[PDB]
């Protein structure tokens, strides 16, 4: 089964998921000088005030904070998006060292981690139908750098001990994802894919320019998670990031000059 090890990592995924070599794969390097400001891009509308988190799950590749997406409670609109996209979950990708961990890069710079807030286009009814559509998902990507702690992240950090191993979940209600956002909503956007199998080319990527800062202690707690299930040989959940993929016939657009 696919993962991030030497024998099942990103360079192997194409064998089970041939789209891995597709025309709109993610992540990508964001070459800031080649991205073009698009003045027709609208400001992002992040409406998370009514978000209902429910659970946090170690799925063996990352941990997902899941939300009630059965109503328009936490939605992403505007920016490059047509219509309304409902928040279904967020998760992170991170490194074994502070110098790596993000999936997108900025002028080849890797951040320590990257947060993905995953939303699906409500015109398709359910996430499973949305992923079959070229405009099915909008993933808001936020870089993490190591510095000062992110207070809004601590509630996540502190529950990780209860979901150390693959398949463990914990109740995780009343978490406010607004606490994970940076100050600015300036962004780059491009059409891409899920960065994990099945690698479907269904994502409008919206990557914020401003990283959030998290503390070394916070990211250290990410790195204590396990890819393995309980009672299996311990493999630390680190370096669960896919590297940048070829941009091919795509233009990255910037919301800002
Ligand atoms: N790294 S990423 O591009 O943001 C993503 N790659 N696979 C993603 N799958 C999901 O969100 C779901 C998974 C399981 C059930 C519902 C939704 S999200
Ligand atoms: Zn992700």
How far apart are the C-alpha atoms of 55 and 65, rounded to whole Å?
6
61 is catalytic: yes
Q: Could you identify the residue written with the tokens 């502190």?
A: 158
E strands, 126-202, where?
137-146, 169-171, 187-192
Ligand 1 atom closest to the CA of 198, numbered from 1:
7
Q: Could you identify the residue written with the tokens 């080649």?
A: 34
Residue ranges of alpha helices (H) inside 48-186 are: 127-130, 154-159
Number of Cβ within 10 Å of residue 84's Cβ equals 18
**Parallel, antiparallel or unpaired: strands 137-146 and 203-208:** parallel
Q: Which two tokens stand for residue 193?
A: 């894919």
Backbone angles phi, psi at 108, to 5 degrees: 75, 0
Cα–Cα distances (Å) from 256 to 36, 195, 210, 251, in that order, read 9, 25, 12, 15
Q: ∠179-184-187 over CA atoms, to 5°?
A: 110
**Pocket (CB within 6 angstroms of ligand 1):** 88-89, 116, 118, 127, 139, 194-196, 203
Q: Which of 194, 197, 240, 244 to mutate to test the pocket of ligand 1 (most atoms within 8 A of CB)?
A: 194
Give the annotated binding-site residues.
91, 93, 116, 195-196
Q: What is the resolution of this structure in A?
A: 1.3
**What dihedral do alpha carbons 9, 215, 160, 198 form, nearest 10°?**
-30
Technique that determined the structure = X-ray
Q: Which of 89, 121, 125 to mutate to test the pocket of ligand 1 (most atoms within 8 A of CB)?
A: 89
Residue 246 three-state SS:
coil
How far apart are the C-alpha atoms of 71 and 179, rounded to whole Å?
21
Cα–Cα distances (Å) from 212 to 114, 147, 149, in that order, read 9, 9, 9
Closest-CA residue to 143 (of 176, 118, 179, 180): 180
Task: Please return the burial class of 7, using the count of CB atoms within 10 Å of its CB with bins 0-12, 13-18 and 19+.
Answer: exposed
How far apart are the C-alpha atoms of 147 and 214, rounded to whole Å?
6
Write down the domain spans for the chain: 1-257
Q: Using an 8 Å Cβ cutoff, are 219 and 150 in contact?
A: no
Task: Please return the burial class of 64, using the count of CB atoms within 10 Å of its CB with bins 0-12, 13-18 and 19+.
Answer: buried
């Amino acid at each position: 089964h696919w993962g991030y090890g030497k024998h099942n990592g990103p360079e192997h995924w194409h064998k089970d998921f041939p789209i891995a070599k597709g025309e709109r794969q993610s992540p990508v390097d964001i070459d800031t000088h080649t991205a073009k400001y698009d003045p027709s891009l609208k400001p992002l509308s992040v409406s998370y005030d009514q978000a209902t988190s429910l659970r946090i799950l170690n799925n063996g590749h990352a941990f997902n904070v899941e939300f009630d997406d059965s109503q328009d409670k936490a939605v992403l609109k505007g920016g490059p998006l047509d219509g309304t996209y409902r928040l279904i979950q967020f998760h992170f990708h991170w490194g074994s060292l502070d110098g790596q961990g993000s999936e997108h890069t900025v002028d080849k710079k890797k951040y320590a981690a990257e947060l993905h807030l995953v939303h699906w286009n409500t015109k398709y009814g359910d996430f499973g139908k949305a992923v079959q559509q070229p405009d099915g998902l909008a993933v808001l990507g936020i870089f993490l750098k190591v510095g000062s702690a992110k207070p809004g992240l601590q509630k996540v950090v502190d529950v990780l001990d209860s979901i150390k191993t693959k398949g463990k979940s914990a109740d995780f209600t009343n978490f406010d994802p607004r606490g994970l956002l940076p100050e600015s909503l300036d962004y780059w956007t491009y059409p891409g894919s899920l960065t994990t199998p099945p690698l479907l080319e269904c994502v409008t990527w919206i990557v914020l320019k401003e990283p959030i800062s998290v503390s070394s202690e916070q990211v250290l707690k990410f790195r204590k998670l396990n890819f393995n299930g309980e009672g299996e040989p311990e493999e630390l959940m680190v370096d669960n990031w896919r590297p940048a993929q070829p941009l091919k016939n795509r233009q990255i657009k910037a919301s800002f000059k």
